[PDB]
Amino acid sequence: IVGGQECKDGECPWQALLINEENEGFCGGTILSEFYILTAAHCLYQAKRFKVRVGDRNTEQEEGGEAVHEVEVVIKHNRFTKETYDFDIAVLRLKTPITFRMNVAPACLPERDWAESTLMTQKTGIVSGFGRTHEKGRQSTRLKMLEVPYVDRNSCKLSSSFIITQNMFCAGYDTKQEDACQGDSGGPHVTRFKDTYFVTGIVSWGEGCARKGKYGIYTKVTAFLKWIDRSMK
Amino acid sequence: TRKLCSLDNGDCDQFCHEEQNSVVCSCARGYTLADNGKACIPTGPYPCGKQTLE
Numbered sequence: 001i002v003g004g005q006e007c008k009d010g011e012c013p014w015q016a017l018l019i020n021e022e023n024e025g026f027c028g029g030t031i032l033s034e035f036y037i038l039t040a041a042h043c044l045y046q047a048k049r050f051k052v053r054v055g056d057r058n059t060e061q062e063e064g065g066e067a068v069h070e071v072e073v074v075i076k077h078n079r080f081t082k083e084t085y086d087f088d089i090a091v092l093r094l095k096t097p098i099t100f101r102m103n104v105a106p107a108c109l110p111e112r113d114w115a116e117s118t119l120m121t122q123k124t125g126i127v128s129g130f131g132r133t134h135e136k137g138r139q140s141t142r143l144k145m146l147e148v149p150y151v152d153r154n155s156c157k158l159s160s161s162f163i164i165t166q167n168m169f170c171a172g173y174d175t176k177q178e179d180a181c182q183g184d185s186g187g188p189h190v191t192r193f194k195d196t197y198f199v200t201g202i203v204s205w206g207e208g209c210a211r212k213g214k215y216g217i218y219t220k221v222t223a224f225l226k227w228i229d230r231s232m233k
Numbered sequence: 234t235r236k237l238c239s240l241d242n243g244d245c246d247q248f249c250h251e252e253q254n255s256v257v258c259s260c261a262r263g264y265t266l267a268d269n270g271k272a273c274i275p276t277g278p279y280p281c282g283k284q285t286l287e
């Protein structure tokens with residue numbers, strides 16, 4: 001995350017972190033329920049073996065609430081392609097159920113029509129993660145969150161060197177130096193509505209991080225609500 | 234002119250749907266619609282969408 005703030009105690013309890021065999025984070029995820037993690041399809045190519053870590057806010061310090069979970073099943077969208085990053089969504093089923101507690105809790109899955117009419121028409125969403133603090137920087141050892149404006153679809157298409165499919169939306173800032181970045185991919189984009197947080201996107205891609213005239217590109221979760229429901233069986 | 238779910242979310246806490254000419258409210262999984270047919274009540278501990286305080 002470029003710019004934005006620390007997640008303070010309890011503020012981003014639906015954050016998951018995909019960690020490699022060396023215990024380094026490489027992608028984010030969202031807790032959907034005791035058993036299921038939402039993430040990006042393209043993250044699954046970023047490591048042979050990985051686990052999921054929840055309840056972590058400071059990677060350099062044991063705060064007590066941390067839990068590592070093993071992945072039992074990887075459910076990747078079959079229509080995902082590296083060529084376009086279209087259908088950039090995947091669900092993970094964990095071997096053992098997540099025990100909800102302080103800093104560990106699911107985000108709500110919305111209903112399609114209402115999310116699109118009511119959530120995605122709000123001023124801003126919230127993206128979070130342990131990713132890079134700037135384009136050329138290193139990964140944050142602190143979990144961060146950032147408020148990102150929904151970006152008009154046609155402005156985004158015009159701003160982009162690559163196709164923006166129906167399964168993507170744009171969020172962030174034109175010139176202001178705030179954005180998601182490398183390592184935040186797969187992570188939560190949520191929208192607050194009356195003190196309740198709904199999953200509205202998955203951190204997908206961008207041309208650098210916080211580059212002028214470029215936005216953050218997110219998987220449009222609302223297009224994948226029947227898919228996610230199916231995947232959670 | 235804003236009507237039904239377009240007028241302050243139909244007074245619903247969460248989901249709002251328009252049926253006939255009438256607002257129907259509902260709730261995320263793990264919540265129950267209150268008696269007033271509008272508010273959403275957590276059924277148990279750590280309901281989705283809520284930041285944690287304990």
Ligand SMILES: CC(C)N1CCc2nc(C(=O)Nc3cc(C(=O)O)ccc3CCC(=O)Nc3ccc(Cl)cc3)sc2C1
Binds near residue numbers: 135183216217
């Ligand atoms: C298949 C198409 C759609 N692509 C998907 C992957 C992709 N990655 C692209 C890219 O520009 N990546 C890149 C280049 C450099 C650098 O060279 O300095 C440094 C870091 C990166 C990764 C930055 C990144 O994750 N950005 C980011 C990711 C998600 C969001 Cl919501 C906002 C920003 S451009 C692009 C286009």
Ligand SMILES: [Ca+2]
Binds near residue numbers: 062
């Ligand atoms: Ca820690």
Ligand SMILES: [Ca+2]
Binds near residue numbers: 174176211212213215
């Ligand atoms: Ca920008």
